[PDB]
Design a protein around this ligand. Structure first.
Ligand code: Y17
Length: 126
């Protein structure tokens, strides 16, 4: 079976709307989401349908862009570093779980290149 997804709603978690978080949605998430290699990353890994019974034995902090998109749209975060960490966890999980050089790793690398480019120009806090 699959685990429950990561949390995307929590009324007692303090949160904010900030210009850096707005950039993470409007620039970072949107750029990666529209990419031709986004599809395997647009929702939690479904280890049942994809026949990956060891996935959640190895990956203990799952993360995906569907979860990030919900967190950004629902104003889940306090700061941009929490969201940047989610993206980095997503990429790292893929490199940890998969065999080097597999298609999925090349896909992650292409998305990560764009991510790094956009994060390099994260705007100053207003
Ligand atoms: C973020 N995700 C979603 C992947 C699911 C299974 N899946 C695998 C590959 C792949 C390529 C395209 C689409 C799905 C693919 C692949 O190239 N090698 C084996 C596992 C595993 C992973 O970490």
């Amino acid at each position: 079976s699959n685990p429950p997804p990561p949390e995307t709603s929590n009324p007692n978690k303090p949160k904010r709307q900030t210009n850096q978080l707005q950039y993470l949605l409007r620039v970072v998430l949107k750029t990666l989401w529209k990419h031709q290699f986004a599809w395997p990353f647009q929702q939690p890994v479904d280890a049942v349908k994809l026949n990956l019974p060891d996935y959640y034995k190895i990956i203990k902090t799952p993360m995906d862009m569907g979860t990030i998109k919900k967190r950004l749209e629902n104003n889940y975060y306090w700061n941009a570093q929490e969201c940047i960490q989610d993206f980095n966890t997503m990429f790292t999980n893929c490199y940890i779980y998969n065999k080097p050089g597999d298609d999925i790793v090349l896909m992650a690398e292409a998305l990560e290149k764009l991510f790094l480019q956009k994060i390099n120009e994260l705007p100053t806090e207003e």
